[PDB]
Amino acid sequence: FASVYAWNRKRISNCVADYSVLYNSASFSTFKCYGVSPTKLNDLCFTNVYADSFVIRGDEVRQIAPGQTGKIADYNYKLPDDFTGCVIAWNSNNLDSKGNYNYLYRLFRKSNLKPFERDISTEIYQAGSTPCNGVEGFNCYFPLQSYGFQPTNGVGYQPYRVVVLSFELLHAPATVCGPKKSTNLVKNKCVNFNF
């Protein structure tokens, strides 16, 4: 996957897939789905579905929610209050054992991030009266830091893969809906049909 601040964005449309098979499996640790009840995903039809994927630490799953606090929820990825989306998160401890030291996350920013903002940039963060230039030092810091994902750590340090699904409902066309099932046929009997 990608970094948390450079979260990966995917656009899916023009397909038919079953959303029920996701929560049916027991391998999904966290499923907080605010937009609609889990069993109604297949019932309703949507458009141009968007998926945002990243990796967070163990004890920050509560940060990913519409309209709450959090350092990651403020400088890395923030959900607007009017967000009828759906959130899945699952452990990936066995996929980063030694541990992994290639993960970066924003820690310092002037203000909170905008909704669905792909803010990619690098700069020496300054927090002092004196201007910051040249080499880093006092009041001149790097806003990106690594993760302590040691293979001998418990909850709070185990990497978690987090995906957020969002959508727009019937802007004008319809491309992706829930699957439909069909039964067998009968003959020589007065039947009410729905062909």
Epitope: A127, G128, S129, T130, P131, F138, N139, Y141
Partner: antibody, heavy 120, light 108 residues
Framework: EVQLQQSGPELVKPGASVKISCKTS????????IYWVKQSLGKSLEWIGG????????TYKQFFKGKATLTVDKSSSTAYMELRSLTSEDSAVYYC?????????????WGQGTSVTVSS | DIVMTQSQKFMSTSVGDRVSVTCKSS??????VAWYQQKPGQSPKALIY???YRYSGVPDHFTGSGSGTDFTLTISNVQSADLAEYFC?????????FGGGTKLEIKR
């Protein structure tokens, strides 16, 4: 809503260690750094140094060796300075100040200062 | 290197004449200064920011200067509460160091 209460006058002995406390209350302490300066009875102002409450950073001037030490705590929300080698001329007043990053750079708020006098 | 003299240590104005003090600095390092008033006994009070701005909490009637490696400040007049010390500021490098200060005396 910014205020600063410091300690009173102190009498020190050469070749000893003393402590001076700068207390900050009524406002957030995590973001803005804390600066320390001296006044030797109306002479030129010397920037003793500065410290960062968040990163626990420490910065001195060009010539400060001898008592170069900084310390802060959030439970008491204050700062402690340790003075050593009070040989012959350190009798002066210490001033503890706080700056503002969004506005009012360069030591907007000051304190009453603590006067330390060296004697036998 | 690091030196601040502002070409004077103390200046005297008797009555009515406008007061102006420079803050000539060292070679080009930047453009950021300040001026503080030091009353005889209590904490310094900030007078001007970067030699040309205004203070919300101070009845500011002041005249400043431009930019570059030289700075100047002009105050309204010599009131009855102007006898104090004048301190200039220079915050570019971490080893902060100010000048010797300026003293305003009412020449009776």
């Amino acid at each position: 809503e910014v205020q600063l209460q410091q300690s009173g006058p102190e009498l020190v002995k050469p070749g000893a260690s003393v402590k001076i406390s700068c207390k900050t209350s009524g406002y957030t302490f995590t973001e803005y750094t804390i600066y320390w300066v001296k006044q030797s009875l109306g002479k030129s102002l010397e920037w003793i140094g500065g410290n960062n409450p968040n990163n626990d950073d420490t910065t001195y001037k060009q010539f400060f060796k001898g008592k170069a030490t900084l310390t802060v705590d959030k439970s008491s929300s204050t700062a402690y300075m340790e003075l050593r080698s009070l040989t012959s001329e350190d009798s002066a007043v210490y001033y503890c100040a706080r700056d503002g990053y969004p506005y009012y750079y360069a030591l907007d708020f000051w304190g009453q200062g603590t006067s330390v006098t060296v004697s036998s | 290197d690091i030196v601040m003299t502002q070409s004077q240590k103390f200046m005297s104005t008797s009555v009515g004449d406008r007061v102006s003090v420079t803050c000539k600095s060292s070679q080009n390092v930047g453009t950021n200064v300040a001026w503080y008033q030091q009353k005889p006994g209590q904490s310094p009070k900030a007078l001007i920011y970067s030699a040309s701005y205004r203070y919300s909490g101070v009845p500011d009637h002041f005249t400043g200067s431009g930019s570059g490696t030289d700075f100047t400040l002009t105050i309204s007049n010599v009131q009855s509460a102007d006898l104090a010390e004048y301190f200039c500021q220079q915050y570019n490098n971490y080893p902060w160091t100010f000048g010797g200060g300026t003293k305003l005396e009412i020449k009776r």
